[PDB]
Amino acid sequence: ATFTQYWSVRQSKRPTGSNATITFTNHVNAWKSHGMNLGSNWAYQVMATEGYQSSGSSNVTVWGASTDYWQNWTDGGGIVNAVNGSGGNYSVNWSNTGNFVVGKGWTTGSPFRTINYNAGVWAPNGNGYLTLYGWTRSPLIEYYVVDSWGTYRPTGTYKGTVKSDGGTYDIYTTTRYNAPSI
C-alpha cells in the first residue's frame, strides 16, 4: 500500500531511566497546523520498540490501569525475542532482524491520549526507535513520536517544530510505496 507517515522526532535522544510523558494532543495539533490530518478510523496505539536491520535490547513499561493492547509484529527476517511482561512491562532481544514493532498500549488510538513510560533499558545496536506508534484509516496513516533512537535519526520532508514535555521535536512527512500495516 501507498501512504504518508507523520513524524515527531526529538532534536536529541531523550534520557531513559525515569518516567517520560508524551502529551499526544500537542503533537496532533502541531501536525494539524501544518496541514497534516489523521484518519477518522483509529487503529492500535503503543509505546513501541521499532527495529530494522539491527540487533539490540530494550525494556519498556507503560502505565495505565487501562492499557490493554499487546503489539508484537515481525516480518520474520531476523530473530526477535519479545516477552509480554506483567502489566505494561515488556522486553525485546532482537538479532540481525529486518522490520519489527513491539510495544504495549491501546486497542483503539485516541487523539487525546496521554502516556507515561519508563524505558528501563534502551540499548539498540543498529536501527531502533523508542517511539509512540499507531495507525489510522481514512486516510491510511502511520504516525510516529520518537523520543530516542540508535544509529539513525528518522528524517524526511521538514515541516516545522513543536515543544512538548520539556523536549523540542522536529516535524517530518515521509511516504512509502508498497507497505502494509501492523
Side-chain angles (χ1 to χ4, degrees):
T2 284
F3 55 103
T4 291
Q5 289 162 300
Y6 298 154
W7 297 84
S8 285
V9 184
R10 255 213 166 205
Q11 289 161 181
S12 64
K13 301 143 82 170
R14 189 177 193 176
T16 83
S18 305
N19 329 299
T21 297
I22 300 182
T23 299
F24 189 52
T25 194
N26 281 158
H27 301 266
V28 169
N29 290 316
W31 295 348
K32 267 160 154 278
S33 68
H34 291 287
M36 297 181 300
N37 289 102
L38 298 169
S40 57
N41 186 4
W42 287 84
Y44 61 86
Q45 185 186 32
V46 298
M47 188 61 194
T49 294
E50 155 97 10
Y52 187 67
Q53 298 184 153
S54 64
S55 308
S57 182
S58 74
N59 185 118
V60 198
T61 291
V62 192
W63 315 109
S66 82
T67 115
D68 54 295
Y69 192 79
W70 163 247
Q71 169 73 3
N72 177 30
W73 183 90
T74 159
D75 56 9
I79 301 305
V80 191
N81 187 208
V83 183
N84 182 4
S86 66
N89 176 248
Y90 73 92
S91 74
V92 181
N93 312 252
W94 69 97
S95 192
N96 223 233
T97 74
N99 210 253
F100 71 78
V101 182
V102 179
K104 322 184 75 173
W106 299 264
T107 290
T108 292
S110 172
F112 306 108
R113 187 71 64 181
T114 317
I115 293 142
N116 306 304
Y117 78 91
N118 183 81
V121 147
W122 180 246
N125 297 132
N127 194 204
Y129 309 139
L130 183 60
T131 175
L132 151 121
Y133 182 83
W135 294 72
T136 68
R137 293 96 150 186
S138 307
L140 168 63
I141 294 181
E142 185 184 16
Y143 59 80
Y144 282 95
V145 170
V146 187
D147 284 344
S148 186
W149 55 92
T151 50
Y152 177 81
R153 184 177 181 269
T155 60
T157 315
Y158 178 78
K159 310 208 86 69
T161 64
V162 62
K163 308 108 282 291
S164 189
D165 308 305
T168 302
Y169 300 72
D170 289 345
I171 302 181
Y172 300 110
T173 49
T174 60
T175 300
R176 292 231 285 162
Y177 303 97
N178 292 25
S181 190
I182 303 185

